[PDB]
Write a protein that binds this DNA or RNA. Structure first.
Ligand SMILES: [Mg+2]
Ligand SMILES: [Mg+2]
Ligand SMILES: [Mg+2]
Ligand SMILES: [Mg+2]
Ligand SMILES: [Mg+2]
Ligand SMILES: [Mg+2]
Ligand SMILES: [Mg+2]
Ligand SMILES: [Mg+2]
Ligand SMILES: [Mg+2]
Ligand SMILES: [Mg+2]
Ligand SMILES: [Mg+2]
Ligand SMILES: [Mg+2]
Ligand SMILES: [Mg+2]
Ligand SMILES: [Mg+2]
Ligand SMILES: [Mg+2]
Ligand SMILES: [Mg+2]
Ligand SMILES: [Mg+2]
Ligand SMILES: [Mg+2]
Ligand SMILES: [Mg+2]
Ligand SMILES: [Mg+2]
Ligand SMILES: [Mg+2]
Ligand SMILES: [Mg+2]
Ligand SMILES: [Mg+2]
Ligand SMILES: [Mg+2]
Ligand SMILES: [Mg+2]
Ligand SMILES: [Mg+2]
Ligand SMILES: [Mg+2]
Ligand SMILES: [Mg+2]
Ligand SMILES: [Mg+2]
Ligand SMILES: [Mg+2]
Ligand SMILES: [Mg+2]
Ligand SMILES: [Mg+2]
Ligand SMILES: [Mg+2]
Ligand SMILES: [Mg+2]
Ligand SMILES: [Mg+2]
Ligand SMILES: [Mg+2]
Ligand SMILES: [Mg+2]
Ligand SMILES: [Mg+2]
Ligand SMILES: [Mg+2]
Lengths: 149, 77
RNA sequence: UAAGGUGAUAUGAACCGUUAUAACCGGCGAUUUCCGAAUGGGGAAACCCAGUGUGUUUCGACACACUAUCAUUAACUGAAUCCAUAGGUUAAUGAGGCGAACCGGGGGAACUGAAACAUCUAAGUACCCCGAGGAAAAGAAAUCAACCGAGAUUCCCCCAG
RNA sequence: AGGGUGACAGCCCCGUACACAAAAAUGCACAUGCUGUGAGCUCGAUGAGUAGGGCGGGACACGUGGUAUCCUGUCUGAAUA
RNA sequence: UUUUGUAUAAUGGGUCAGCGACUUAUAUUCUGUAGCAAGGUUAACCGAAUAGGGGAGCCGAAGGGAAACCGAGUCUUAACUGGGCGUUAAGUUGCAGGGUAUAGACCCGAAACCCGGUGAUCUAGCCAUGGGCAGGUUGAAGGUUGGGUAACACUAACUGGAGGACCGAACCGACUAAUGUUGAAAAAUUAGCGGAUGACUUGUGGCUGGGGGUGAAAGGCCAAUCAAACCGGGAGAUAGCU
RNA sequence: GUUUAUUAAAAACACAGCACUGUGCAAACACGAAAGUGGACGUAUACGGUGUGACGCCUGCCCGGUGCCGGAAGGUUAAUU
RNA sequence: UGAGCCUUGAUGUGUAGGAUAGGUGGGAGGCUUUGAAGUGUGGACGCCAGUCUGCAUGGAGCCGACCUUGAAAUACCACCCUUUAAUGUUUGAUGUUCUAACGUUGACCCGUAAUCCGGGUUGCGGACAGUGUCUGGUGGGUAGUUUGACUGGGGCGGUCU
RNA sequence: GCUUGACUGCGAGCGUGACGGCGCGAGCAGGUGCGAAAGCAGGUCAUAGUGAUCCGGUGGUUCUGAAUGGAAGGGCCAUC
RNA sequence: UAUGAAGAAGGCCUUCGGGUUGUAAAGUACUUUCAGCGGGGAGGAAGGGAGUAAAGUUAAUACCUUUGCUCAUUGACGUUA
RNA sequence: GCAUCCGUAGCUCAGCUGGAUAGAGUACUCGGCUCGAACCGAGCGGUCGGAGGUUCGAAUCCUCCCGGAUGCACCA
């Protein structure tokens, strides 16, 4: 009794997984409660289309991820106007909010959430490397400087 | 009566044999069972008197397709 | 078509006709009580008892028409239960029963024969049931042949006891 | 041909052989007019719980026999030009 | 007629008349007959049609061997001088007849088996609703009033009216005897007999159907029929018997 | 009291009583291919079956045979694989 | 919780002994920074003899191996057997708990003027019960039949070539 | 003492049975045994010691093989 | 965390027999707090704004202001509890 | 007609579970002690159903039989 899952019933798998199962299971329980659907030509193709469509969604998002990445990765250095450090020690911290605004003015929009200030909170003055977690895995890299106010 | 509503199976008659080949008249009746089939289109349970062989064809043919033939047959499910 | 004629037992009476509305024959209509599928309900068949509606009036009634069930279709309404569905009420069609054999199908004996008797025979006969027609059934090769070929089905004579 | 006529009728009678007949209804067949009905060509498609199998029976002349073929009550179950 | 044997006192027949039993189909063998003859003959069917056509087939002229095969030979066997079966010998088609076979198979006759129906107006049981049981006895429990007990118990009297109680008509049964036995009557009558308020009896309806019913049980009863009703059918069952 | 209507009315049948046994109620059982009905609109102080047959005194011994009941280790054993 | 199988490891005394040589071979090879032997008991099993070996231990050693042994050795590699310890797998065996099939001759609602039926709600039961096919047992409960002949009638007795 | 004639294929002609059948048989062919040979041996002095057909089993066999090649199955022989 | 004694060795003492560390370890089962990592996810949030419609408020209920509503709202901590 | 299994002091049985060599209870003798009961321990009482195989070795494994049993089949 081949049947296509609509959810993660017990150990049968997850949504969209044709599996051989004893007739009774689906003939009177899985199907009349809507937890799964019989594996028939029409239904299986539609689910496989849904499968490949989410794969295309995954492709498209990860494709646009590398887009943002390169857009700003290759150089694209930005600097902000921070109160003159005066012989060093900066007069303030450069936070996620401020650093996101800087790259956003450059064009490459970034939300502070994505920003990940490595090994510090941008306390010194002058040049300081940065990084951005553009995607769920893709890592970037940008050079940011500081000057007078 | 003992008639399958899907396949139309009805009682048939035959012989009991023996080691002496003696023949006595008997009847073969279908393996009929009253089952409540879930029809998705009407979101309802419809009870049918089906044979065990009929149960197999319902999965293969679909619940809607068999009922369409039944309406053509005028079996009054 | 007609000079005769009112059926028979079966006379008689009283009459009708005779050149074409006597009678007789045929075609087409009209009428067609009651019972009977019987169908408004019931019932011990030829009987009993209604309802509705139209129209009559002498105010006592009266005369027609419709009102079975089932199947199919379409409307309208209509539960538990919100929709629905079941169900319900109408309206259209159709079916009901009878009838000889033949036909198809669903069931299906025993006596008997075997010199008994179980397998077998009788016999898919008798009989019962369902359905149909003037015929029915079958029927246009997933057939046969045998290395050559034939080309649906049905029926007859052989093949052949 | 037959039948009838007071006993056995070719020529007595009814008929028979032949030759004819329908206002109306209707059968059959041909033609024809309407109402449906689709012909031809190309490219496709090619009947699945089925065939087959196990079990129990039945039908084939063929009684399970070494028994093909057909129908299936039961349990399974393909290939598909 | 049947028998070893019948005047037999074994069966049959009152008599007459009428009716009443060797047939039919197909196939096969034999005889007779006719035709043709190493050939004979067609069947269905066609057909103005008992003709003719149709030789599809059938039988015969070649057999031997399980068969393949061989062939006036062949088989048997390794092989037969052998032995078995064959080789000189006319058949075939009609008609008639004698037989056989399958059909009821000369006719009449079973007790039964099977199938489908009709019957509980009789009877058996049950169900519903009604009715009937003169009269005369016996006198339970209980009750009352006394006597007795602390109270009972117990006892007496009087009331009471219990019972598959008693005697006995209707009613119901049917034990004995006589008659009757081609009856008044296919089960009764006469004189007696048992029960007779009950497990009683009865009216009118209803229900149970044949391998079934019903049965206070006899294989009883189920329409004068019961160890398997009646009617029709299978069916002209079968009958080494008369 | 009942019985062989139509040759047998009895010592036969029934009988109250007694005992055994089955039956927990969708009861056992019975009639029904089945549905269902009776049992019973009852519930073990009930119902069915069997034998005995008021009452009185009593109802002894045998479980080898045949049944029934209980047990389930082992032996044997069908369809199926 | 059985069990067929998954792979691994491991197990293997006649005696003689070289003895934890199961057998069967090839077998002077073996041996080898990959750590020479190797220490630390690593334990198990086993003769409790011995054996392999858990991670380190150190730094070149390491080993076929004659009397004997059937055989020549846990030197050696291949192939099987046994003993099999674990390993997945594939089938079952019970037990427990579910609900969703199925049951309900439980309650309630509706169809509905209804002790039928159907539907709904709920409770209980529940992968049983129950039913179908197949199959073992039982089965005068019900059928169809058999149950010989000769014979100083038959039966009994005796007889049957 | 030596041996397997308790031989294989056949069989003129007879006997005896209603039949099925049973019995006797010289001689012939091929191969044997015992005898030096003539010769004898196709079980036992003879007459009882037995069971038809169907069905199934075993061995053998160029007989058959349902289109063909096989095979199954059947036939024949031996035999249960 | 539990098992775990040959009471390991080693350490130290020693009446040189021992004891002591100490079931401590090793080993053998077991578990993964938090810290590692990853993925979710409250609460702090009330607000005003834009609209709406009505009401009060008027000469006109225009103006407002009060209701209700409608849409979109905002969290420094915070890669939060 | 096969298939399986069994055969061991006189007896009842372990089989010395399948080759590195026979055990018990009972029977019997003696003894222990003791009138017999009744108790105990020694001893005696088997070449392993028989005949072929295999190996250095089997009553034990292989072949063949004998006797016994249970199974099958089963319609000359
Ligand atoms: Mg009427
Ligand atoms: Mg007969
Ligand atoms: Mg017609
Ligand atoms: Mg096709
Ligand atoms: Mg199949
Ligand atoms: Mg079959
Ligand atoms: Mg046969
Ligand atoms: Mg055979
Ligand atoms: Mg066959
Ligand atoms: Mg005389
Ligand atoms: Mg006389
Ligand atoms: Mg002619
Ligand atoms: Mg010819
Ligand atoms: Mg010859
Ligand atoms: Mg002639
Ligand atoms: Mg003749
Ligand atoms: Mg009385
Ligand atoms: Mg009296
Ligand atoms: Mg009296
Ligand atoms: Mg009678
Ligand atoms: Mg009878
Ligand atoms: Mg009759
Ligand atoms: Mg007949
Ligand atoms: Mg007769
Ligand atoms: Mg009396
Ligand atoms: Mg009498
Ligand atoms: Mg009477
Ligand atoms: Mg009497
Ligand atoms: Mg008695
Ligand atoms: Mg007694
Ligand atoms: Mg007993
Ligand atoms: Mg006993
Ligand atoms: Mg009988
Ligand atoms: Mg008979
Ligand atoms: Mg006799
Ligand atoms: Mg006789
Ligand atoms: Mg001699
Ligand atoms: Mg062939
Ligand atoms: Mg953490």
């Amino acid at each position: 009794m081949q049947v296509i899952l609509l959810d993660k019933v017990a150990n049968l798998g997850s949504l969209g997984d044709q599996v051989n199962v004893k007739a009774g299971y689906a003939r009177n329980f899985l199907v009349p409660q809507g937890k799964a659907v019989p594996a028939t030509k029409k239904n299986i193709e539609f689910f496989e289309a849904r499968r490949a469509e989410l794969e295309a969604k995954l492709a498209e998002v990860l494709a646009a991820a590398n887009a943002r990445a390169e857009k700003i990765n290759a150089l694209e250095t930005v600097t902000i106007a921070s109160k003159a450090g005066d012989e060093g020690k900066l007069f303030g911290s450069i936070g996620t909010r401020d650093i996101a605004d800087a790259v956003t003015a450059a064009g490459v929009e970034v939300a502070k959430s994505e920003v990940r200030l490595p090994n510090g909170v941008l306390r010194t003055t002058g040049e300081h490397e940065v990084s951005f977690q553009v995607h769920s895995e893709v890592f970037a890299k940008v050079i940011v400087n500081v000057v007078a106010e | 009566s003992r008639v399958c509503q899907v396949t139309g199976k009805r009682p048939v008659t035959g012989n009991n044999r023996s080691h002496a080949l003696n023949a006595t008249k008997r009847r073969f009746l279908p393996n009929l069972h009253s089952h409540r089939f879930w029809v998705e289109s009407e979101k309802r349970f419809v009870t049918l008197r089906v044979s065990a062989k009929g149960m197999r064809v319902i999965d293969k043919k679909g619940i809607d397709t068999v009922l369409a033939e039944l309406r053509a047959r005028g079996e009054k499910y």
